[PDB]
Amino acid sequence: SKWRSQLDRFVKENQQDLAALFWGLWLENGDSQGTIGIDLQPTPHFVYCPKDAVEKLNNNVENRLQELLGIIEHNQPEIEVLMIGIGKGEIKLIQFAPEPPPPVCFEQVGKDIDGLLELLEQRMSGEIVV
Amino acid sequence: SKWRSQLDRFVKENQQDLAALFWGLWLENGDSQGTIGIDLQPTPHFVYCPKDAVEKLNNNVENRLQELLGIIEHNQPEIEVLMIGIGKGEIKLIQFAPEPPPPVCFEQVGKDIDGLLELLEQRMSGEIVV
């Protein structure tokens, strides 16, 4: 269960870059691909999670995050970032309203999603271990 | 308006305590008093912002955050901390899903809301200035 607090600390230290990536992917995909996931195995990597898979997977003892589907539906990508981390099937909800908001974060980092994916995934490696 | 970034730094570094206070206030008051606000003057201090008051104050040119009212109505306090910082009439949304969730932060920090309020308020003093 320690990976949860490792993921928590990583998010805390990387909110602006995660917001830039969140917003960049929002621009390209909106919600058509589902929810941005961080699958932690075999090493942490960004994925998309269709709403079915989230419900299927929140339908599990270790999870059962109350109203998760509504939280995912009601997230406002212009002001707040939402992702889900996944370690051996258990969800940790990632949600934060950064400063500046995600679209400004995107403009201020000045990186495309490919650049942010590689930078963030390198940073995760060996920092979050399941 | 540097206070927006100082408040962002404060929240990032104090998620557990703010989560414990948020849930302690939920235990005490539920939604009977409105939304938890942080009034930044003369010193940052926690207040309650009734629904009508939030709305009137969001009805101002520096604010007009899209879907603010809906974010407030949909907040899931077992999962999500929600507060609004208020600096010279400027709203800043605070929303984040802590690790562990808010009711566990309250249990783990082992203090009542009076203790939490005093600690968090002294901490913010000097650190977030308008």
Residue numbers in the entry:
A (entry chain B), B (entry chain A): 13 to 142
What's written in the study?
The carboxysome is a natural proteinaceous organelle for carbon fixation in cyanobacteria and chemoautotrophs. It comprises hundreds of protein homologs that self-assemble to form a polyhedral shell structure to sequester cargo enzymes, ribulose 1,5-bisphosphate carboxylase/oxygenase (Rubisco), and carbonic anhydrases. Recent studies have identified the chaperone protein CcmS, which can interact with CcmK1, facilitating β-carboxysome assembly in Syn6803.
As determined by SDS-PAGE and Native-PAGE, CcmS functions as a dimer in solution, with the molecular mass of ∼16 kDa for each CcmS monomer. We solved the 1.99 Å crystal structure of the CcmS dimer in space group P212121 by molecular replacement. The two CcmS molecules are rotated symmetrically, with an interaction interface of ∼900 Å2, primarily mediated by hydrogen bonds and salt bridges.
